[PDB]
Ligand binder design. Structure first.
Ligand SMILES: [Ca+2]
Ligand SMILES: [Ca+2]
Ligand SMILES: [Zn+2]
Ligand SMILES: [Zn+2]
Lengths: 164, 5
């Protein structure tokens, strides 16, 4: 079923900050903001961790869109091939989630990669989830009405405990 | 893609 990262890195503070740093031409900025919140809350409702949004500076989880090389060691590669990537909890690059601007992204009303699904998968990595062997899992390794699977819930609660 | 660092 689920996996974590080696040595089970996790956020150990009660509050973790996040920032939407850069946007996509494909959607209104407000829509990206609302879908990012919804994705974080899918995972957050299950566990004792709280997320605080910031609008400037460095936050724990930096989220954004980029083309090509963008300051980490893993440049994007134009249309196709890698779509997005995210880093396990930790200082610096840890927690950050990046999306390739050279794809097409949608809120569900157009052609594109469904941004809510993709953000829920990437932010699973930002919280410490690896990939699952269960085809039903959001954390399965390969890509409109979804929720987290039982396997996704079991793994995140294994890592953080359950929310009371 | 999940990356380590
Ligand atoms: Ca970070
Ligand atoms: Ca690409
Ligand atoms: Zn990156
Ligand atoms: Zn992944």
């Amino acid at each position: 079923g689920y996996s974590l990262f080696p040595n089970s890195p996790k956020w150990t503070s009660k509050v973790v900050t996040y920032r939407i740093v850069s946007y996509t031409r494909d959607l209104p900025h407000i829509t990206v903001d609302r879908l990012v919140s919804k994705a974080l809350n899918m995972w957050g409702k299950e566990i004792p961790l709280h997320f605080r949004k910031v609008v400037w500076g460095t936050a724990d989880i930096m989220i954004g869109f980029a083309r090509g090389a963008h300051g980490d060691s893993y440049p994007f590669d134009g249309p196709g091939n890698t779509l997005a990537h995210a880093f396990a909890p930790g200082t610096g690059l840890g927690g950050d989630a990046h999306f390739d601007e050279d794809e097409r992204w949608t809120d569900g009303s157009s052609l594109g990669i469904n941004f809510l699904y993709a953000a829920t998968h990437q932010l699973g990595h930002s919280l410490g989830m690896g990939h699952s062997s269960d085809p039903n899992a959001v954390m399965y390794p390969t890509y409109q009405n979804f929720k987290l699977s039982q396997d996704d819930i079991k793994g995140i609660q294994k890592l953080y405990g359950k929310r009371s | 893609x999940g990356l380590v660092x």
